[PDB]
RNA sequence: GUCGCGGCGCGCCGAGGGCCCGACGCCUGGCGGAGAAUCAGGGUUCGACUCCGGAGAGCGGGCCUGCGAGACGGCCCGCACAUCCAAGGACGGCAGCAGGCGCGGAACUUGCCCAAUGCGCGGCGCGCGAGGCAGCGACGGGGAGCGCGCGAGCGAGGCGGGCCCACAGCCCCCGCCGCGCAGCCGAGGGCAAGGUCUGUGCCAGCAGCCGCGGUAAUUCCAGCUCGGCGAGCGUCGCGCGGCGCUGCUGCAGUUGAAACGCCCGUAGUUGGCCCCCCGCCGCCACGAGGAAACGGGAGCGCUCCAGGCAGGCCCGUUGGCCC
């Protein structure tokens, strides 16, 4: 119904503060559980040493082997799974060679057929992945 | 091509014994070859007739335009000029010999070293 | 309980116009109802209105000419600054040229145009377009 | 799987790039885009307007 | 610290809400064809200058007449639009400022003025001539094709005296 | 006791004080404001930084001098951590400026100089890593190019002079030679642009989303052609808009998410009509008075422009006025 009294500003201010939390987006912006949980911890991107190169299956109905690396982030010692983008790019990434990882673009959700990979490699050993693919700089 | 010189906002300054003037150098299709070249015309307007006692400065060409806006410090006498003139602008006049300052860091290193040994 | 005397009156007039009834009765008569209706009578939106005396709150028999389109109240009556009047007219009324916003002013109950000419603002009683 | 990676990339036969002339740049390129699209009415016209990359527009211009 | 910090700066262009609308892509290309524009940012600047001027006109029209701001600020908007030539001299009212297009911003620009004076064979010709400083407005050579002349300077727009009248006599290719 | 008032402190007496108009406790990847981002309106989010006020110079304390400091480019001490040592001792404190190290996704030269603008002392003038200048610097903002055209023209340079400058330099002017030069993402839809030709054959990959790939791939890998924007374009993170998906304007609750099983009831919020003429309230208007910058905004052609407060023989030329 709503309250419309010249002196009921306090109630409306309290109702807005209480019901603001129902949206997942306000909670994922102000509750702070996300900031602690995120391995990027609110950073635009993170750096970390490769530990394992893993072949991850695509979700149905797609049938494919997506190529990814498990990365332990130097910043918080937290192992994530990051897809290495483009074709034959995994060959450039060796083991333990350091990779810079950014998120996929769904703000912390897994995107595409790939499940649980919220991150993708952008720079291998200080060399941009896209450059090594376009053969602009060698490995 | 010709250079025509007009001075504007001339102000008498007996405080510093100088005439503060705005020199306008109009050279359409040509260039004034240095402030010294056009000093005589500004000296004529002032009637000082002494080119030396005039200090030309802040000469700014306008984009494309022949007009160049500049300023003059026409001191009554050379002695007054020496008393009230930035030393660098007297060297830039070529009127005074160049005194040589040492590196500021070298000057302050020696100051610190003096303080270190019995102030 | 009956918190707003004017809201029930302008609702009972709009319902009557939609039916196409020429005359209607308002159960409680207030001085502010008479002033709102008087403004509509000086704007041609209503016709003659007669307040019968029952020795209590009083009734109003209102004559209509089909001319009125919508009559309402803004509750709570919010005091409107002089420069805020136009922002209210851009949402509450259709067209800057037609319509009326009735605001109680220190000078008296007046339309938005009258308030704009006197360059003063006040609490909004309601609106009739 | 991981061992068979980039198989289409290696398989693709290397294809040579045509040595096209340098295109007009800036205002001149905008002039040519405007000329082709609105003025002339020949490059994109089969008697009616057509899309820039249309197969009919190709072959006609090569 | 550093007076540079205290120097101001602003963006003079306003990109469209939707970038790939076919009607609004083609019209911008036509407005680059008739005005010799290098990039869409120049058309966006034209709409940013018009929108601000229109917003002043709309905020004054809503204001009551004889409210002092409408009389003073409105006269200063009209005078500016008349001095540039964006507003036709005859109209002399605030309402006509609202009913204006970016064509009026473009027409006052120097590149379009040179073609009107018949000095330039085309708008593409004029742009190159102004870059080559062959054009002088009121005795000052200009190198900017978006200079935008005022109604008084329209007559004073002329070929730079030192450029195509051959005072140099050995210009560019002729020299060697 | 203090510069002074005060539970500020103590002695004594009394039992108060604060609270659902949220006391108290906890937590804060919490300096505040002038402001900024985005935006019809209403709003939302951020407030390290320029100006203003506070706070702190590894962390706690304590002090002296002075008119003013609980001062750290003063001292004393405890802890943590350095430093040199002839082993007895001494000796620090870059959240000044460069510069390094570590850390992180991320951030400039151990440059020069007091010439401007201030300030400290001193009539004839120095001191200043305040501040200024240069370097670096696609944080970003602004202005021009990559031709015009049909025979002529530039500017990018270079080289000179001038100008400018603490000194150079840049800009700009002037002669001389003269040497235009594009990316980054896309083309199934959303969303602008091939139903082109290979390779591949649910593989490889792509694809924010829906989807393509299993042999006629408009979606991959190349060529070709084409679109968008442009000296910038793509990617990620986040804020705002989108989103009347937070709803004051302005959301919904029969069935989609959702009326408390019912009733009483305090706090809270809300209460008909009535007196013209009076006091208090809120209310609206208009004033005073209170920093600018910013944001507008008068006027002024930095060649335009982002800027700036300039200018020109001029209101006592300005720099109004607003927030």
Contact (Cβ atoms closer than 8 angstroms) between residue B56 and residue B23: yes
Give the helix/strand (H/E) hosting D8.
helix D7-11
Interatomic separation, CA of residue B105 and C1' of nucleotide F110, rounded (Å)? 12
Q: Is there a contact between B62 and E140 if contact means CB atoms under 8 Å apart? A: yes
Residue C14 — φ and ψ, nearest 5°? -65, -40
Cross-strand bridge partners of residue A45: A102
State phi, psi for A112 to the nearest 5 degrees: 75, -165
Q: Which residue is nearest to nucleotide F214 (CA to C1')?
A: A63
Å from the E113 CA to the F3 C1': 76
User: Which residues 3-42 of chain B have a CB within 8 Å of chain E?
Assistant: 28-29
Whole-number Cα distances in Å, C87 to B42, C122, E87, E95: 64, 14, 29, 20
Q: Which of D24, D25, D26, D27 to mutate to test the interface with E (most CBs of E within 10 A)?
A: D27
Nearest residue to A91 via CA among C39, D5, C84:
D5
Q: What is the dihedral of CA C49, C52, C55, C59, to 10 degrees?
A: -60
**Chains meeting C at 3+ CB pairs closer than 8 A?**
A, E
- DSSP category for residue C70: -
Start-to-end C-alpha separation, chain D = 43
CB contacts, 8 Å: E167 with chain B:
29
Tally of domains within chain E: 1
Residue C100 to residue C92: CA distance in whole angstroms: 9
In contact, C73 and C32? CB cutoff 8 Å: no
Q: What are the percentages of helix, strand and coil residues in chain A, rounded to 5?
A: 25, 30, 45
Q: Crossing angle of helices E40-62/E22-33, nearest 10°? A: 100
Nearest protein residue, CA measured to C1' of F201: D8
Query: CA geometry: angle at E62 spanning E59 and E66, to 5°?
Result: 100
Query: E123-131 and D27-37 helices cross at what angle (nearest 10)?
Result: 180
What letter would DSSP give residue A102? E
- The pairing of beta strand B67-75 with beta strand B18-26: antiparallel
> Which residues are CB-contacts of C47 (< 8 A; sequence separation ≥ 6)?
C41, C62, C63, C64, C65
Token readout for B7 is: 């001075």
Tracing tokens 């294809």 back to the chain, one arrives at D15
- Six-digit token string for E129: 């001539």
Give the whole-angstrom CA distance, residue A103 versus residue A82.
8
Q: What is the CA radius of gyration of chain E?
A: 20
Contact of A77 with A85, CB cutoff 8 Å: no
Tell me whether residue B81 is in a domain. yes
- Report CA dihedral (D48, D54, D60, D62) to the nearest 10 degrees: 160
Tokens read off for A45 = 């991107």
E64: Cβ contacts below 8 Å, ≥ 6 apart: C116, C117, C119, E70
**Span CA (E69) to C1' (F60), Å:** 62
| Residue B100 forms part of a structural domain | no
Strands C59-63 and C49-52: antiparallel
Quote the CA–CA distance of A42 and B68 in Å, as a whole number: 57
**DSSP for A60-95, written as a single string:** TT---EEEEEEEEETTTTEEEEEE--STTGGGT--T
**B63 with E162: Cβ contact below 8 A:** no
Tokens linked to C44:
């041609």
State, as a whole number of angstroms, the distance between the CA of E150 and the C1' of F209: 52
For chain B, the chains sharing at least 3 beta-carbon pairs closer than 8 angstroms are E
**D50: distance to nearest CA of chain A, Å?**
34
Q: Is residue B62 part of a domain?
A: yes
Do strands A99-103 and B4-13 pair parallel, antiparallel, or not at all (unpaired)? unpaired
CA–CA gap between residue D21 and residue E128 (Å, rounded): 23
Record: contact E33-D28, CB cut-off 8 A:
no
First to last CA, chain B: 65
Cα nearest neighbour of B62 on chain E:
E140
Buried b / exposed e over D9-47, threshold 16 CB at 10 Å, is eeeeeeeeeeeeeeeeeebeebbeebebbeeeeeebeee
CA of E146 to C1' of F106 (A): 39
Give the distance from residue B2's alpha carbon to the nearest chain E alpha carbon, in angstroms. 14
- Cβ(B34)–Cβ(B77) under 8 Å? no
Find which of A6, A7, A9, A11 to mutate to test the C interface (most C CBs within 10 Å of its CB): A6
For A27, the token pair is: 């909670």
Determine the protein residue whose CA lies at the shortest distance from the C1' of F190: E20
**CB contact at 8 A, C2 and C27:** no
Half-sphere exposure of D48 (CA within 13 A, CB side): 4
**Contacts of C6-11 spanning 24+ positions with Cβ under 8 A:** C6/C30, C6/C32, C6/C33, C6/C36, C6/C73, C6/C125, C6/C126, C7/C72, C7/C73, C7/C75, C9/C33, C9/C36, C9/C37, C9/C60, C10/C36, C10/C71, C10/C72, C10/C73, C10/C126, C10/C128
**Touch between C and E (at least 3 CB pairs under 8 Å):** yes
Residue B104 lies in a domain: no
Which structural domain, as residue segments, surrounds residue E59? 19-166
Q: What are phi and psi of A108, to 5 degrees?
A: 95, 5
Q: Which residue has the tokens 């007996």?
A: B14
Q: What angle do CA E162, E164, E170 make, to 5 degrees?
A: 80
Spatial strand order of the sheet with C23-26 comes to C23-26, C59-63, C49-52
In terms of Cα–Cα distance, which of A79, A82, A70, A69 is closest to A118? A82
- State the Cα–Cα distance between residues E93 and E74, nearest whole angstrom: 9
* Token pair in block for residue E28: 């911008």
**SS3 readout for B61-107:** ECCCCCEEEEEEEEECCHHHHHHCCCHHHHHHHCCCCCCCCCCHHHH
CB E26 within 8 A of CB D34: no
Query: What whole-number distance in Å separates Cα of residue E71 and Cα of residue E86?
Result: 20
Q: Is residue E5 part of a domain?
A: no
Residue whose structure tokens are 């899309």: D51
For E136, the closest chain B residue by CA position comes to B64
Enumerate residues 6+ apart whose C-beta is below 8 A from E80. none
3-class SS at B2? coil
Beta bridge partners of A67: A55
Rounded to a whole number, what is the distance in angstroms from the first to the last CA of chain A? Answer: 66
Helix, strand, coil percentages, rounded to 5, for chain E: 50, 5, 45
Cα C70 → chain centroid: 10
Q: What is the CATH number of the domain that holds B47?
A: 3.30.70.3370
- What's the number of CA atoms in the CB half-sphere (13 Å) around residue A72? 8
User: Which residues of C fall below an 8 Å CB-CB distance to A?
Assistant: 75-78
Contacts of B68 in chain E (CB under 8 A): none
CA–CA distance, C3 with D26 (Å, rounded to integer): 70
CA B94/CA B39 separation, integer angstroms: 14
Structural domain range at position B33? 4-93
Q: Distance between CA atoms of E72 and C116, rounded to whole angstroms?
A: 19
C-alpha closest to that of A80 among A107, A44, A112, A117: A117
Nearest CA among C67, C58, C60, C54 for reference residue C23: C60
> Which three-class secondary structure state does DSSP give residue E19?
coil
Instruction: Confirm whether B73 is domain-assigned.
Output: yes
Identity of the residue in D1, D6, D8 whose CB atom sits nearest the CB atom of A91: D6
Q: Indicate the SS3 state at residue B35.
A: helix
Residues 6+ apart with CB under 8 A from A52: A69, A70, A95
CB contact at 8 A, B24 and B60: no
Residues of E in contact with C119 (CB under 8 A): 64
What residues in E contact D38, CB-CB < 8 Å?
26, 29-30, 33
Chains A and D touch (3+ CB pairs under 8 A): yes
Q: How many residues does chain B have?
A: 119
Please check whether residue E53 is in contact with residue E45, taking contact to mean a CB–CB distance below 8 angstroms.
no
**CA separation for the pair D38, E26 (Å, rounded):** 9
Q: For A41 and F59, how far is CA from C1' in angstroms?
A: 29
- CA distance linking residue B92 with residue E67, whole number of Å: 59
E86, E103 contact by CB (below 8 A): no
Q: Name which of A67, A87, A90 is nearest D8 (Cβ-Cβ).
A: A87
Listed as ranges, the nucleotides of chain F within 7 A of a protein C-beta are 21, 29, 40-42, 50-51, 103-106, 111-116, 124, 127-133, 140-155, 161-167, 172-178, 180-182, 185, 187, 191-196, 198-214, 217, 220-231, 235-240, 245-253, 259, 268-275, 282-286, 293-308, 311-314, 320
Cβ neighbours of B117 (radius 10 Å): 6
Please tell me what DSSP assigns to residue D49. Answer: B
Is E124 in contact with D28 (Cβ distance < 8 A)? yes
Dig out the tokens for C40 from the structure. Answer: 């509509």
User: E strands, chain C, where?
Assistant: 23-26, 49-52, 59-63, 71-73, 100-104, 109-111, 123-128
Q: What gap in Å lies between CA A48 and CA A30, rounded to an integer?
A: 27
- Show the beta-strand stretches assigned E in D1-62: none
Tokens of A60: 């149905």
Give the number of residues written for chain E: 176
* Residue with smallest Cα–C1' gap to F153: E172
What is the CB neighbour count within 10 angstroms for residue C58?
A: 16
Long-range pairs for E76-81 at CB < 8 Å and ≥24 separation?
E77/E53, E81/E53
D residues 10-49 lying closer than 8 A (beta carbon) to E: 26-28, 30-31, 33-35, 37-39
Alpha-carbon gap, residue E70 to C112, rounded angstroms = 19
- Total domains in the fold of chain B: 1
Helices C5-19 and C31-41: crossing angle in degrees, nearest 10, is 40
The Å distance, CA of C1 to C1' of F265, is 19
Residue B48 lies in a domain: yes
Rounded CA separation C128/C45 (Å):
8
Q: Between C and E, how many CB-CB pairs are < 8 A?
A: 5
The number of beta carbons lying within 10 Å of the beta carbon of residue C102 is: 26
B65 Cβ neighbours under 8 A, 6+ residues apart: E139, E140, E141
Residue C103 and residue C113: Cα distance in Å, rounded?
A: 10
- Does residue B98 form part of some domain? no
Angstrom distance (rounded) from CA C96 to CA C15:
26
Is residue E176 in a domain?
Answer: no
Helices E40-62 and E69-84: crossing angle in degrees, nearest 10, is 150
Distance, angstroms, CA B24 to C1' F289? 49
Give Cβ neighbours of residue D39 (< 8 Å, ≥ 6 apart). E33
């Amino acid at each position: 119904s709503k309250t419309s009294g010249l002196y009921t500003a306090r109630k409306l201010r309290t109702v807005r503060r209480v019901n603001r939390w129902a949206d997942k987006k306000y909670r994922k912006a102000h509750l702070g559980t996300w900031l602690k949980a995120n391995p990027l911890e609110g950073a635009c991107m993170a750096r970390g040493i490769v530990t394992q190169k893993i072949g991850i299956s695509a979700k149905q109905p797609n049938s494919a082997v997506r190529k990814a690396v498990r990365v332990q982030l130097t910043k918080n010692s937290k192992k994530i799974t990051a897809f290495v983008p483009r074709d034959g790019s995994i060959t450039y990434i060796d083991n333990n060679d350091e990779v810079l990882v950014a998120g996929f673009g769904r703000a912390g959700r897994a995107v595409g057929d790939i499940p649980g990979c919220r991150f993708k490699v952008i720079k291998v050993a200080g060399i941009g992945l896209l450059a090594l693919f376009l053969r602009k700089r060698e490995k | 091509p010709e250079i025509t010189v007009k001075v504007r906002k001339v102000l008498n300054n007996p405080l510093l014994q100088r005439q503060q003037c705005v020199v306008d150098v109009l050279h359409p299709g040509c260039t004034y070859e240095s402030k010294e070249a056009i000093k005589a015309k500004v000296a004529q307007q002032l009637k000082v007739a002494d080119q030396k006692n005039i200090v030309l400065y802040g000469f700014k060409t306008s984009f494309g335009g022949g007009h160049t806006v500049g300023f003059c410090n026409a001191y009554q006498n050379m002695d007054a000029l020496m008393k009230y003139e930035p030393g660098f602008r007297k060297i830039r006049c070529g009127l005074i010999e160049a005194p040589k300052p040492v590196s500021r860091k070298q000057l302050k290193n020696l100051k610190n070293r003096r303080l270190k040994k019995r102030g | 309980v009956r918190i707003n005397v004017l809201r029930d009156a302008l609702k009972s007039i709009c319902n009557a116009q939609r039916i196409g009834k020429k005359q209607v009765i308002v159960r409680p008569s207030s001085k502010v109802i008479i002033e709102f209706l008087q403004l509509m009578q000086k704007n041609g939106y209503i016709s003659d209105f007669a307040v019968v005396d029952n020795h209590r709150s009083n009734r109003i028999v209102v004559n209509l000419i089909g001319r009125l389109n919508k009559a309402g109240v803004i509750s709570p009556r919010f005091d409107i600054p002089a420069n805020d009047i136009e922002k209210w007219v851009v949402n509450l009324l259709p067209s800057r040229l037609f319509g009326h916003i009735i605001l109680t002013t220190s000078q008296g109950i007046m339309d938005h145009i009258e308030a704009q000419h006197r360059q003063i603002g006040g609490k909004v009683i309601g609106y009739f377009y | 799987g991981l061992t068979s990676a980039g198989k289409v990339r290696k398989c693709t036969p290397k294809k040579e790039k045509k040595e096209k002339p340098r295109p007009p740049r800036g205002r001149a390129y905008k002039r040519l885009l405007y000329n082709k699209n609105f003025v002339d009415d020949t490059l994109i016209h089969n008697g009616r307007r057509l899309g820039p990359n249309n197969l009919l527009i190709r072959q006609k211009l090569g | 610290p550093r007076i540079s910090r205290h120097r101001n700066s602003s963006k003079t262009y306003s990109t469209p809400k939707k970038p790939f609308t076919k009607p609004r892509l083609d019209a911008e290309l036509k407005l680059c064809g008739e005005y010799g524009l290098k990039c869409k940012r120049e058309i966006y600047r034209a709409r940013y200058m018009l929108a601000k001027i229109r917003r002043t006109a709309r905020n004054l029209l809503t204001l009551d007449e004889n409210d002092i701001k409408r009389r003073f600020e409105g006269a200063a908007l009209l005078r500016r639009l008349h001095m540039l030539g964006i507003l036709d001299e005859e109209k002399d009212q605030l309402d006509y400022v609202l009913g204006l297009r970016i064509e009026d911003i473009f027409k006052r620009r120097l590149q379009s003025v040179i073609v009107e004076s018949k000095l330039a064979k085309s708008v593409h010709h004029a742009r190159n001539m102004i870059k080559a400083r062959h054009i002088s407005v009121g005795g000052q050579i200009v190198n900017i094709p978006s200079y935008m002349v005022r109604i008084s300077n329209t007559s004073r727009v002329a070929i730079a005296d030192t450029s195509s009248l051959a005072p140099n006599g050995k210009p560019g290719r002729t020299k060697r």
